[PDB]
Design a binder for this molecule. Structure first.
Ligand SMILES: [Cl-]
Ligand SMILES: [Cl-]
Ligand SMILES: [Cl-]
Ligand SMILES: [Cl-]
Length: 204
């Protein structure tokens, strides 16, 4: 695309915030900034690293339902996002956030960028970087804590080449998985038999 900025409309104002937007869009490229707009309820501007990332986000996220609303994702005519008059969202978090230095961006080198799955939303999220003996029940209890729908089923892949786990989280619908992605991505999981917590990674 001609610009690294996109606009997202049809967000749920009570549910969404900058981190939760990042948690969805980071699947498709580096996210630099998210800005909610007082005058356009349900809309946010998102600056990605480049127009290739914008295009991937549009092609994969445009027209998807989340919290009863159709999300629309489209190119912005702005070349960049600037902090405006920042305000507190419904959840008490700030309307503007810069993620350019985030450890959780996944496309920071060309080599790293190429390893990311680029898939359309479906009713399954893949997870990785979970604790070594993570269980279905562990994910159930995290979803309860977050106030999001439990997956109907959790698969933990048996094969493990590091002290971490990967697998699948399944819901009955696309929209349930997408709604959950924004809340659950980058959750800090407690690590029993291990000294540091694990940052849960989700993707389609
Ligand atoms: Cl929905
Ligand atoms: Cl892929
Ligand atoms: Cl945990
Ligand atoms: Cl980690």
């Amino acid at each position: 695309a001609d610009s690294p900025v996109l606009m997202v409309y049809g967000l749920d104002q009570s549910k969404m915030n900058c981190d939760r937007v990042f948690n969805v869009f980071c699947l498709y490229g580096n996210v630099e900034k998210v800005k909610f707009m007082k005058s356009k309820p349900g809309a946010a501007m998102v600056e990605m690293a480049d127009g290739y990332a914008v295009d991937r986000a549009i092609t994969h996220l445009n027209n998807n339902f989340m919290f009863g609303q159709k999300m629309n994702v489209c190119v912005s005519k702005q070349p960049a996002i600037m902090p405006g008059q920042s305000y507190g969202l419904e959840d008490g978090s700030c309307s503007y956030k810069d993620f350019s230095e985030s450890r959780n961006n996944r496309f920071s080198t060309p080599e790293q960028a190429a390893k990311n799955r680029i898939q359309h939303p479906s009713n399954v999220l893949h997870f990785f970087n979970a604790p070594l003996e993570v269980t279905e029940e562990n994910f159930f209890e995290i979803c309860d804590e977050l106030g999001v729908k439990r997956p109907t089923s959790v698969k933990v892949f048996s094969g493990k080449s590091e002290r971490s786990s990967s697998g699948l989280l399944e819901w009955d619908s696309k929209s349930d998985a997408l709604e959950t992605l924004g809340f659950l991505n980058h959750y800090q999981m407690k690590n029993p038999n291990g000294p540091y917590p694990y940052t849960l990674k989700l993707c389609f």
